[PDB]
Amino acid sequence: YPSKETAHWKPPPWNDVDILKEKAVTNMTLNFGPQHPAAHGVLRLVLELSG
Amino acid sequence: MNNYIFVLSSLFLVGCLGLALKPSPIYGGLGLIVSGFVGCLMVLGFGGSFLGLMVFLIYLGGMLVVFGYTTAMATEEYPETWGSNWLILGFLVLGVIMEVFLICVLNYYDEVGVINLDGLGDWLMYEVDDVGVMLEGGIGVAAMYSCATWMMVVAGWSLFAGIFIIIEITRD
Amino acid sequence: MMNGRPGHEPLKFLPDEARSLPPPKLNDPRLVYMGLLGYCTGLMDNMLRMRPVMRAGLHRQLLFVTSFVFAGYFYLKRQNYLYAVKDHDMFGYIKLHPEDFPEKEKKTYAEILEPFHPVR
Amino acid sequence: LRYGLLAAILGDKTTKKLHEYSRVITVDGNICSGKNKLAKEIAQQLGMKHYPEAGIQYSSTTTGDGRPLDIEFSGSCSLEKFYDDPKSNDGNSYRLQSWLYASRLLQYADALEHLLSTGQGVVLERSIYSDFVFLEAMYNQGYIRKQCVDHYNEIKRLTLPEYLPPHAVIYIDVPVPEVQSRIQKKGDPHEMKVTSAYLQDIENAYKKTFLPKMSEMCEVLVYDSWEAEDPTKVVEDIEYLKYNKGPWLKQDDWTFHYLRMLVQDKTEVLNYTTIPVYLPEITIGAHQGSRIYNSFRELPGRKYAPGYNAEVGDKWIWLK
Amino acid sequence: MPSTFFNLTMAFSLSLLGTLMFRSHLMSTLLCLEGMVLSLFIMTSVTSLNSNSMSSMPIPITILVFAACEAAVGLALLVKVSNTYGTDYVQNLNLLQC
Amino acid sequence: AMVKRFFESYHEVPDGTQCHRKTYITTALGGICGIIGSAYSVSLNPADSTLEAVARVGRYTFTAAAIGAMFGLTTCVSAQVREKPDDPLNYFIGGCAGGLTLGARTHSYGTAAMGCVYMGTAAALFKIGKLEGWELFPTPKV
Amino acid sequence: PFLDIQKKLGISLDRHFMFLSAEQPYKNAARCHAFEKEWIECAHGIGGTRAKKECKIEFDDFEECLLRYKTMRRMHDIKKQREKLMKEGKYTPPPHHSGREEPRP
Amino acid sequence: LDLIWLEKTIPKSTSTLHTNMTTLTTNQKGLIKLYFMSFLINIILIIILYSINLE
Amino acid sequence: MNPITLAIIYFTIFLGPVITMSSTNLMLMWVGLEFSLLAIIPMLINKKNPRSTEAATKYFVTQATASMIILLAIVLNYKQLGTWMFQQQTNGLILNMTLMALSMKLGLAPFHFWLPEVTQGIPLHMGLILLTWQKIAPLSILIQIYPLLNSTIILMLAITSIFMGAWGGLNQTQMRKIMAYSSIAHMGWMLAILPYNPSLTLLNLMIYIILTAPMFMALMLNNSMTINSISLLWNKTPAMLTMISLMLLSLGGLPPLTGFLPKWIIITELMKNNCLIMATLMAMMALLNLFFYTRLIYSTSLTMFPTNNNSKMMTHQTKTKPNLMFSTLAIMSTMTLPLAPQLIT
Ligand SMILES: CCCCCCCCCCCCO[C@@H]1O[C@H](CO)[C@@H](O[C@H]2O[C@H](CO)[C@@H](O)[C@H](O)[C@H]2O)[C@H](O)[C@H]1O
Ligand SMILES: CCCCCCCCCCCCO[C@@H]1O[C@H](CO)[C@@H](O[C@H]2O[C@H](CO)[C@@H](O)[C@H](O)[C@H]2O)[C@H](O)[C@H]1O
Ligand SMILES: CCCCCCCCCCCCO[C@@H]1O[C@H](CO)[C@@H](O[C@H]2O[C@H](CO)[C@@H](O)[C@H](O)[C@H]2O)[C@H](O)[C@H]1O
Ligand SMILES: CCCCCCCCCCCCO[C@@H]1O[C@H](CO)[C@@H](O[C@H]2O[C@H](CO)[C@@H](O)[C@H](O)[C@H]2O)[C@H](O)[C@H]1O
Ligand SMILES: CCCCCCCCCCCCO[C@@H]1O[C@H](CO)[C@@H](O[C@H]2O[C@H](CO)[C@@H](O)[C@H](O)[C@H]2O)[C@H](O)[C@H]1O
Ligand SMILES: Nc1nc2c(ncn2[C@H]2C[C@H](O)[C@@H](COP(=O)(O)OP(=O)(O)OP(=O)(O)O)O2)c(=O)[nH]1
Ligand SMILES: [Mg+2]
């Protein structure tokens, strides 16, 4: 029975699997050096990290 | 010293109020650690020993995992504390005021019912076997190995099945 | 209601005191109907598997009929026993409490003045 | 014992059967590109099972007595009608394409069932992975509606991800002017009516979509006609492929068990091709639908389940 | 004993109120469940001590054992929620309204 | 509690007398039903702001209190005028007046008409239950 | 229990630590052991409905022993009456109630 | 009467009421936060009824 | 899942209720309910999509919260009486929160809102376990303390469940949601009679289960999740049309089907106790269930909805289902009213 509240409801997917918008890649970006014992004092190693 | 256990159970109440307000789980985790410590003291205060130390040890381990999970999966740019939001702060203060009020009023109406501020400390320990030897709480817990083995069978099964459960939940 | 009664064995399908009751006839109408349901179950099973309804699997049909009758006989014995116990308790309780169940002396219609309600 | 968890537990396991040539190979290309002769020789030289391209009657020939059925029982679609009038308002174009996708899906499940249960490889001629190049060509030529495209992409979304893709995809590249010449030499009256624009759409879909998509997870081998004409050269390339990419690398005994459970159950395979989306092109009213269904169950060998049809010589029914 | 058990029951009630009144983080709610467990552990332990019921002291330990299993499953579920949506917010868990 | 007693006072005196007290009791009862309904409405169908939630709580509670006032007043005046304390018809008239009020507040003749019949019948049956000793929640006996 | 499997098999998985009077480690009787033993024994064999009325004496005693409402109130009354008299200067606690007892033994 | 008012007052008003009640109770947001709030109301109501009916 | 996992998890799903039904100690009953919650979660989320993750999460937080309230009641009773079972002397508020929390575990209205959502988010065979096997342990606890329960709360829960099960099922096009509302309505009947005659609670539970099990198997045969999907039965498996129609009419309680018996006997027993008004309201609103079942019967067996061209390929394929358990339950759930005296006493 249509209602104003539920006018925007769509039927669920046929196999129960929803197509969701792509999730956000969220890697940590870290400055490894230049002032770092392992960076030889002058290397700015920009790292993308996951954990 | 006659107010000692009431003070502890009063501190425990505040800890659960802080947890109920649900700030960032970082401070929620801290709130349970303090409540666990206060809860250990209450068990000790009633003559416990093993049970109080167990629950603190278990909750120390439990909140360390929750800290790790919080930094990965339950964090925001600006984690909330109890003071950050005026609304949460107000209900923290109001909740503490309502505790003082609730204990004050209940003391007036009954005086010996749920609250008996006149008799605090007189009704903590009821009976104690003065000349006994084998009385500590660890002896009671150890009955799982001899007289209450069914309790240990079900406990052991749930931990064993838990390994298979969490492996299934977490596989992609 | 009857579970806590005296002399109640736990999880006993057919207590030994049930052996004083007459057993059901093997052609009891309730047991004949049970076997008919088993026959219907066999035919419905054939239909659902797209098999000839009456012809396919007479061995499977016979097992369906025999299982329903076999189970129904023993279940009917248990149900007979439970109803017999209910009457045994009810009447026994009536005898222990004759003050709660007096014999009511009824009056003849020569003495009873029922009101007449004319139809008109 | 029908295959299941018990049979799997009692030793019946896929990884014991896989060997060097337990592969799924598909041969693609435009119309008249020589896929069939190549696919037959790849399978023959490698000891693999050749599956001819799934057609309209594929389901008819793999069930019952394997004989073709009347067309109303078999998708009620016609390739010849498609070439005569690709814009017929009876929905023949998309009804054909939808039927051919489902017949390909059935064949892909049959081929996967064969590989998983025996360890012998298979060689296919196009597949569900490459069926869309024909759908795109129809839509680009205005032969089908957009809603037909959306219907097709929904069914594909619901069915294709459940399967493992082929190990190696072999593509024969023949340009459209050469394809047209081969169709005219082929001498089929209706296929000769295919426009070159339609053939170009197929090639465009193949080279912009299918090949880049497939290279992410399969070994792709592209040949021109002159290379493909010597099938022993193609086989030699197959013998030295490495197969170091794709989903087949992370399969184990129990993921193979559950895929096998899917692909032996054909009504489960075909489930989402029949979702109740009421596209007019592929919707049958109950009067036609029930007349057709009643006649199908009056065909020989079709009234009852196989093994229960006394009129085709089935015996011992009363003990089955 | 009288006043301690009143305060412990209030502590459980607050933790339950925390459970029933969601904010955003699912993890904050999982912490409230651990709060109810903690309150019930102390209540059971203090009761056993006050009555000198040594045969009941296994029971508080079994409360913690199953609470650990409940908490482990809760965290395992929270990993799944975070993988889908990139947060543990409960407002995302609304696909089953239709 | 005394709150329960305040509601038993409705039946302490026969209908058609003390119509002021009976109107307060039914107005209070209607308000409580409005507060309960409002709580479920705002909790399960939240408003766009807090001032709309509070506005909706007031709309439901006053409308429910108005229905309870009209029912209680009309029932007592009807019994007073007709001099019939024990007539379920007095309660049907009151329940219809309550049903008409609900329709007037929501701007609907269909709710007024449908409200009048359903609420009248429910109220009339309540009076019959009070007279004939029906129990809404009997305790187990057999 | 809903299914009396334990009774049918004659085993005890959880029947034997059901109340205070049950067996305790090293025979350390729980508080109110004698009152709970009396209440359980009065009730045995007559059913819950009858036990509620006819074992009312035993239950009240056990309830008082365990929860001690009356004991707490009685001591509150004595200590409250003592507070009133001491303020009025009509009662002086003896030496042994003031911490200057002659300890025994 | 037969085509209008006997229809409107008996079968058609019954149909309207239960359709209206159906849409007001089944239009749920699927938010666990809202359901748990409504369960809190249920708990409070049950505690209030117990208190007033306490002899 | 590999076989070792299946065996352990299914064994724990079976074990929990057996522990609950066999336990004297209330703590071991709670332990049994804990096993059920923990073991069923991995099955709920096995397929691993956002909807199954939502369903498993909503199920977990509801069930774990209800489990804590049950434990609170057990602990409060242990404090009051020094025992691990509820007695005649147990404080009435302790018993009322037990009833509240168990009814939330069962999905009785107004604690019902989770159940249609969780059933919608999981596979049909898991919905079957959720609505049948998982009801037994919480009900078994309630049956043990039936003389202690408050008739007022029960009837209010019961009438609420019947009302919302009815109106809830009226708006559904999803089969899994229709079954969930059918569950709630039937639980309302089971609960109404529990404080009067717990044997009739069990009679309703058994008849509900043997109706619901073959109904789920019929949905499972083609994986029919919607009304429009089940409306294709006439073309896919027409042999099932007779038994689905009779099972639906039996679920609705139409005589002379077996499903009329639970409603009939519960009304009889409610009126032996003067519970006339509730019994009338219950029976009248249970007709609304028969309406949405009839509309379902209209779209499956009494009319023929439009079919599609790909369904012809399905008619070429042989099926190996249903198992013969379907036929047995289907027949005994519809055609056993003549044997009514053997089912009530
Ligand atoms: C379906 C899964 C379940 C099967 C798996 C579990 C198998 C059972 C293993 C646990 C066995 C417990 O076995 C049980 O032990 C207890 C002590 O603990 C014994 O208990 C015995 O000693 C105690 C000591 O206090 C006495 O108080 C008690 O009266 C007496 O019966 C039981 O007589 C025995 O039946
Ligand atoms: C707008 C029409 C509504 C139709 C619905 C039915 C309306 C009739 C109900 C209202 C009648 C007057 O209100 C009714 O009487 C008083 C109020 O003081 C209370 O009356 C009753 O109270 C309690 C029930 O808790 C009984 O034990 C008591 O014997 C009886 O007096 C009822 O709680 C209330 O229901
Ligand atoms: C003893 C008999 C006593 C009779 C009085 C009690 C009966 C009460 C009937 C209430 C009727 C509903 O009240 C009536 O609702 C209509 C709905 O169209 C509204 O009517 C007004 O607004 C609506 C829209 O809001 C416009 O379409 C309409 O043209 C205008 O008149 C008014 O709010 C009121 O005129
Ligand atoms: C369309 C909706 C209405 C559906 C109608 C339902 C059927 C008709 C209802 C008839 C009403 C019953 O009427 C009522 O019956 C009950 C039960 O016997 C009796 O009422 C009395 O029953 C017993 C004594 O036997 C008392 O303990 C009880 O307190 C009292 O209610 C009276 O006879 C009458 O008060
Ligand atoms: C108390 C009296 C009991 C009455 C018993 C009720 C009997 C069952 C009624 C439901 C009827 C089942 O529904 C009926 O199913 C049969 C197949 O079995 C269908 O049968 C028809 O269509 C199917 C395909 O759909 C064909 O294969 C079949 O040969 C043809 O006869 C009917 O079109 C359908 O209407
Ligand atoms: N509309 C449509 N036609 C198709 C589809 N698959 C094949 N066909 C048609 C195109 C051709 O006219 C006809 C013959 O198939 P082929 O493409 O394979 O041509 P042919 O077999 O002659 O050459 P080959 O050696 O196999 O490469 O089948 C399809 O998915 N959709
Ligand atoms: Mg070809």
PDB file of C-alpha atoms in Angstrom, chain D residues 20 81 94 104 107 134 144 150 171-172 186 189 207 214 222-223 248 252 269 284:
ATOM      1  CA  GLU D  20      48.275 -29.495 -16.018  1.00  0.00           C
ATOM      2  CA  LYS D  81      14.079 -13.943 -38.041  1.00  0.00           C
ATOM      3  CA  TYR D  94      16.055  -9.408 -27.239  1.00  0.00           C
ATOM      4  CA  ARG D 104      25.364 -20.196 -22.409  1.00  0.00           C
ATOM      5  CA  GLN D 107      26.579 -24.750 -20.838  1.00  0.00           C
ATOM      6  CA  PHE D 134      26.082  -9.197 -29.202  1.00  0.00           C
ATOM      7  CA  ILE D 144      16.612  -3.523 -28.735  1.00  0.00           C
ATOM      8  CA  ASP D 150      19.023  -3.019 -18.156  1.00  0.00           C
ATOM      9  CA  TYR D 171      40.775 -14.204 -29.338  1.00  0.00           C
ATOM     10  CA  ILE D 172      40.883 -14.404 -33.131  1.00  0.00           C
ATOM     11  CA  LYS D 186      29.416 -18.948 -46.287  1.00  0.00           C
ATOM     12  CA  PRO D 189      20.589 -16.480 -47.016  1.00  0.00           C
ATOM     13  CA  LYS D 207      38.262  -4.843 -28.134  1.00  0.00           C
ATOM     14  CA  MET D 214      39.480 -10.410 -19.269  1.00  0.00           C
ATOM     15  CA  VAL D 222      45.176 -12.753 -29.439  1.00  0.00           C
ATOM     16  CA  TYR D 223      45.790 -14.102 -32.938  1.00  0.00           C
ATOM     17  CA  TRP D 248      41.552 -20.010  -9.529  1.00  0.00           C
ATOM     18  CA  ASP D 252      40.652 -24.896  -2.115  1.00  0.00           C
ATOM     19  CA  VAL D 269      21.967 -22.324 -12.011  1.00  0.00           C
ATOM     20  CA  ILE D 284       4.368 -14.729 -21.795  1.00  0.00           C
TER      21      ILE D 284
END
